Ligand binder design. Structure first.
Ligand code: DO3
Ligand code: DO3
Ligand code: CL
Ligand code: CL
Ligand code: CL
Ligand code: CL
Ligand code: CL
Ligand code: CL
Ligand code: GD
Ligand code: NA
Length: 129
């Protein structure tokens, strides 16, 4: 599923991601745009052989099982395919664990380089939320 901006904002808010760990909703929407272009089915292979999955490009090295990242962990206790569903619940629940792990949203490279320090409220501007 390719979400619209306000559609994704509403879903993230409903699932409690807004202000989670102090990160306002626009941070999460901005991260999703640059990680996945709002596409739940996005997948991208990393240099080390892990893969990133879903709207927030969550990494099989630590967070989900894809059966092809030998030696990796599955700290969200999910198949990585659960992160590709039209329903973002699993991605949100796993993102909450990631952003709580000490590094905050710096875990998302596209967020650090393209969202951090910007006017992120622009990403939710105009939406009814
Ligand atoms: C903040 C960094 O630590 C992030 N971290 C980098 C790698 N870590 C480094 C280390 O923990 O020294 C080694 C693996 N780490 C072991 C563990 O955490 O117990 C599991 C994955 N972690 C889970 C987490 O950290 O909550 C996510 C990635
Ligand atoms: C192997 C190293 O990770 C040892 N570690 C070095 C420092 N870590 C590094 C990191 O976790 O990235 C940061 C603090 N760490 C956060 C956490 O672990 O959740 C708490 C203490 N840790 C608990 C543990 O790791 O079992 C012991 C010391
Ligand atoms: Cl929309
Ligand atoms: Cl915001
Ligand atoms: Cl694996
Ligand atoms: Cl594990
Ligand atoms: Cl933080
Ligand atoms: Cl990570
Ligand atoms: Gd860690
Ligand atoms: Na894994």
């Amino acid at each position: 599923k390719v979400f619209g901006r306000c559609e994704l904002a509403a879903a993230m808010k409903r699932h409690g991601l807004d202000n989670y760990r102090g990160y306002s909703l626009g941070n999460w929407v901005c991260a999703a745009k640059f990680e996945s272009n709002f596409n739940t089915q996005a997948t991208n292979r990393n240099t080390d052989g892990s893969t990133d999955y879903g709207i927030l490009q969550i990494n099989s090295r630590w967070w989900c099982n894809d059966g092809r990242t030998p030696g990796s962990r599955n700290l969200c206790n999910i198949p990585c395919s659960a992160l590709l569903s039209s329903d973002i619940t699993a991605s949100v629940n796993c993102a909450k664990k990631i952003v709580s792990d000490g590094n905050g949203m710096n875990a998302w490279v596209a967020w650090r380089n393209r969202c951090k320090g910007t006017d992120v409220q622009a990403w939710i501007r105009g939406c009814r939320l």
